[PDB]
Design a protein around this ligand. Structure first.
Ligand SMILES: O=C(O)CNC(=O)C(=O)O
Ligand SMILES: [Mg+2]
Ligand code: NI
Ligand SMILES: [Zn+2]
Length: 331
């Protein structure tokens, strides 16, 4: 078995190898990359997502989210308070303010320490889940707005034709902005490109060990656990590396820098934080190996996680028994 310790792998494709996305994902899996739950892909030196970022300040963040934490430093939840709309220009200025900017630090490790020590005492503002793309339409390789769609993958593999579309989303982050422990909707893959700015640190649990994370989370958030049989779908719970180590949960960490792609694999729990002002683009995708994960994916039926028009059809076809009670939570 390749990569038996489930280490995060880093790949450096040539421009020639960067021409066939599906084939490269299959290559990475042949090398055991999926066992980690997360892989880094450094694009060929000749590749660019776009010519410049010089005119992005006019993008609107219609509902910036203030991430308010409750709990203790290593075990907390966050809630998103909606704020008034602001432009990317306005948001960047806020990120750079004395109140919100990245603190002095020695290196990524000192900054990680400061994050876990201090996150709960601040409420950073996140411009998340903004439909759009920053790839130039002439970028032909690894353009997240030109990928084959999940609906077309299900059609090719299973023969069924369903409604729905699949488009990317932009994320504008600042120091301490946080993504809680989650897998993707329907345990899909995701791909994330860090277009610009300061890094993003990721933590990931190997898919083969995901249930160990779930069991810990039920112990650490016991009322959440009673309210919903899949509450990590709410994307509110954080657990520090220290806590994971104290409880024997296998995990890995890696820092993504501007210009790099990350891939999350089916049922790879992941969480992380941003080091400073940045802009990422991400989208979910499928391969044939995903289909069995989609059939087995947990769902939130308490009604909190409340998910997309396109996810309806996935549940309908892959989880017909659930269909019924799941759409009761979504209607
Ligand atoms: O970048 C973020 O805030 C969160 N992204 C993801 O969880 C992803 O790409 O799967
Ligand atoms: Mg603009
Ligand atoms: Ni994700
Ligand atoms: Zn729920």
């Amino acid at each position: 078995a390749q990569n038996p310790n489930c280490n995060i792998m880093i790949f450096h494709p040539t421009k020639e190898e960067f021409n066939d996305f599906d084939k490269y994902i299959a290559y990475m899996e042949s090398q055991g990359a999926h066992r980690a739950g997360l892989a880094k892909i450094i694009p060929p030196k000749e590749w660019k997502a776009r010519e410049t970022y010089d005119n992005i300040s006019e993008i609107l963040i219609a509902t910036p989210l203030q991430q308010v934490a409750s709990g203790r430093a290593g075990v907390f939840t966050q809630y998103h308070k909606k704020k008034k709309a602001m432009t990317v220009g306005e948001y960047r200025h806020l990120a750079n303010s004395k109140k919100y900017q990245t603190p002095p630090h020695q290196n990524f490790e000192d900054l990680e320490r400061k994050y876990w020590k201090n996150r709960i005492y601040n409420s950073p503002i996140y411009g998340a889940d903004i439909s759009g793309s920053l790839f130039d339409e002439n970028t032909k390789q690894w353009n997240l707005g030109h990928l084959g769609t999940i609906q077309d993958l299900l059609e090719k593999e299973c023969g069924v034709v369903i409604e729905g579309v699949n488009t990317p989303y932009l994320y504008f982050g600042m120091w301490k902005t946080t993504f809680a422990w989650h897998t993707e909707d329907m345990d899909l893959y995701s791909i994330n490109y860090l277009h610009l700015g300061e890094p993003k640190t990721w933590y990931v649990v190997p898919p083969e060990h995901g249930q160990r994370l779930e069991r810990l989370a039920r112990e650490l958030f016991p009322g959440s656990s009673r309210g919903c049989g899949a509450f990590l779908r709410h994307k509110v719970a954080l657990i520090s590396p220290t806590v994971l180590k104290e409880n024997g949960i296998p995990f890995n960490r890696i820092t993504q820098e501007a210009g790099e792609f990350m891939v999350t694999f089916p049922y790879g729990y992941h969480a992380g934080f941003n080091h400073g002002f940045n802009c990422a683009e991400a989208i979910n995708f499928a391969t044939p190996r995903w289909i069995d994960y989609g059939k087995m994916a947990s769902q939130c039926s308490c009604g909190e996680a409340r998910v997309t028009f396109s996810m309806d059809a996935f549940v309908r076809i892959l989880q017909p028994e659930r269909y019924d009670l799941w759409k009761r939570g979504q209607d």
